[PDB]
């Protein structure tokens, strides 16, 4: 299966600060990378799909970029409600796989 | 819009079709060639009343809604018109879901009868990708 | 509004078979692809499998043919069956639409030796 690796495992961010999360694929997956946000006790919520396509209702500060094996999720100006664990997931190959996650927490 | 071969190959590559669920980029270029001859405005009214739309000739009986097909399941959750744009995003996204079904690319008759079994990589040869 | 809801046993013994169901409202079960995903406590996410419109299924090899996903169009819901469970199967189980747009809230399933 394709191995998805996220970094850093934990990201400390001060409210208002820019936040950059990384995700890498063990092999090329084109633009078949999706980003999810998961708050404690809740199901993951899809934020970005196909590397950079935005979802209606999702704040503009969330943006995805990258292709091939290197992808990035950027939060231009993090707001306190953004603290959560973020996961990337590839859909290029079955079985679909998730990165290990990046826990974004207040600093 | 009528795509140029390499223009489409590059577009499809950027849209993540190369090796999507095991199908090399050549398969998709070949499929588009024989389904619509690279024409995004292609349209074909089927016998059952349904209609095939776009560069990948996606049918309104199961994949999109054209408001005139009684059976329409609209599995891709989009109006068929979105499949007639020069922007292939919608067609690609729907194609990916289609190919994620049991039939795989067999869902496309043109691919089954004209591409499968041949050297599909020939369709991207000479293209800088 | 689309709503998925998991239901099933929250506790079970090893070697038993886990049976979960996901009921959908606001959308037709026969008009989309559906899947199951799980998250071991303190761990990340792992895809279990999904079923497409034609009924074809795709299962994660990590489960080693112990899983079954089926659809009950009459009750607009789909189910998950996992045989020979062990502690390694303890986790919050989620159902979701293939596209990832909608997810159930998840159900904790604990396998107690």
Q: SS3 for C12?
A: strand
Q: Look up the CATH number of the domain holding residue A100.
A: 2.60.40.10
> Within an 8 Å CB–CB cutoff, is residue C72 touching chain A?
no
DSSP secondary structure letter of residue A96: P
Judged by CB atoms closer than 8 Å, whether chains meet at C31 and B74 is answered as yes
Q: What is the per-residue DSSP string for chain B?
A: -B--HHHHHHHHHHTT-TTBTTB-HHHHHHHHHHHHTTBTT-EEE-TTS-EEETTTTEETTTT-B-S--SS---TT-SBGGGGGSSSTHHHHHHHHHHHTSTTGGGG-HHIIIIITTS-GGGGGTT---
Using a CB-CB cut-off of 8 Å, the residues of chain B touching C33 are 75, 97, 100-101
Q: SS3 for C88?
A: helix
Selected for mutation to probe chain C from A96, A97, A98 (highest C CB count within 10 Å) is A96
Domains and CATH numbers, chain C: 1-113 (2.60.40.10)
**Nearest CA-CA distance, residue C41 and chain A, Å:** 11
Using a CB-CB cut-off of 8 Å, the residues of chain A touching B9 are none
C-alpha torsion sign, points C36, A93, A86, A103: positive
Cα–Cα distance, B118 to B108 (Å, whole number): 15
Q: In this structure, are residues A24 and A102 in contact, taking their beta carbons and an 8 Å threshold? A: no
Using a CB-CB cut-off of 8 Å, the residues of chain B touching C98 are 97, 100
> Within an 8 Å CB–CB cutoff, is residue B17 touching chain A?
yes
Q: In this structure, are residues A62 and A50 in contact, taking their beta carbons and an 8 Å threshold? A: no
Q: In this structure, are residues C27 and B75 in contact, taking their beta carbons and an 8 Å threshold? A: no
Cα–Cα distance, B16 to B12 (Å, whole number): 6
Q: Which experimental approach was used here? A: X-ray
Resolution of the deposited coordinates, in angstroms? 2.0
CB count within 10 Å of CB C101 equals 15
Catalytic residues of B: 35, 52
Cα–Cα distance, C51 to C32 (Å, whole number): 9
Domains and CATH numbers, chain B: 1-129 (1.10.530.10)
Judged by CB atoms closer than 8 Å, whether chains meet at B103 and C99 is answered as no
Number of domains in chain A: 1
From chain B residues 48-77, the ones with a CB under 8 A of any chain A CB are none
From chain B residues 95-114, the ones with a CB under 8 A of any chain A CB are 96
Cα–Cα distance, A92 to A72 (Å, whole number): 17
Q: In this structure, are residues C111 and C40 in contact, taking their beta carbons and an 8 Å threshold? A: no
Q: Range of A102's domain?
A: 1-107
Q: Is C43 left (phi over 0), alpha (psi -120 to 50) or beta?
A: beta
Cα–Cα distance, C44 to A86 (Å, whole number): 10
């Amino acid at each position: 299966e394709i191995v998805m690796t996220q970094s850093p495992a934990t990201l400390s961010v001060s409210p208002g600060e820019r936040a950059t999360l990384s995700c890498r694929a063990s092999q090329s997956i084109g633009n078949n990378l999706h980003w999810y946000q998961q708050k404690p006790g809740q199901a993951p919520r899809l934020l970005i799909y196909y590397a950079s396509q935005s979802i209606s209702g999702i704040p503009a500060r969330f943006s995805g970029s990258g292709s091939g094996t290197e992808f990035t999720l950027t939060i231009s100006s993090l707001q306190s409600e953004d603290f959560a664990v973020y996961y990337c997931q590839q859909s290029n190959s079955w079985p679909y796989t998730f990165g290990g996650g990046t826990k974004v927490e207040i600093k | 819009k009528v795509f140029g071969r390499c223009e489409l190959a590059a577009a499809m590559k950027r849209h993540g079709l190369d090796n999507y669920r095991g199908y090399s980029l050549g398969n998709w270029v070949c499929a588009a060639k024989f389904e619509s001859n690279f024409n995004t405005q292609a349209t074909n009214r089927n016998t059952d009343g349904s209609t095939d739309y776009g560069i990948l000739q996606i049918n309104s009986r199961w994949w999109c809604n054209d408001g005139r097909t009684p059976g329409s399941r609209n599995l891709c959750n989009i109006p068929c018109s979105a499949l007639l744009s020069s922007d292939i995003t919608a067609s690609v996204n729907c194609a990916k879901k289609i190919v994620s079904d049991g039939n795989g690319m067999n869902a496309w008759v043109a691919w089954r009868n004209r591409c499968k079994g041949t050297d599909v990589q020939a369709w991207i040869r000479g293209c800088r990708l | 509004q689309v709503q998925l809801q998991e239901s099933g046993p929250g506790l079970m013994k090893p070697s038993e078979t886990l049976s979960l169901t996901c009921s959908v409202s606001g959308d037709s079960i026969r008009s989309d692809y559906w899947s199951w995903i799980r998250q071991p406590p303190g761990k990340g996410l792992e895809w279990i499998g999904y079923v497409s419109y034609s009924g074809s299924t795709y299962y994660n090899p990590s489960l080693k043919s112990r899983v079954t996903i089926s659809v009950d169009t009459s009750k607009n819901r789909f189910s998950l069956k996992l045989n020979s469970v062990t502690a390694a199967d303890t986790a919050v189980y989620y159902c979701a639409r293939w596209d990832g747009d909608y997810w159930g809230q998840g159900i904790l399933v604990t396998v107690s030796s």
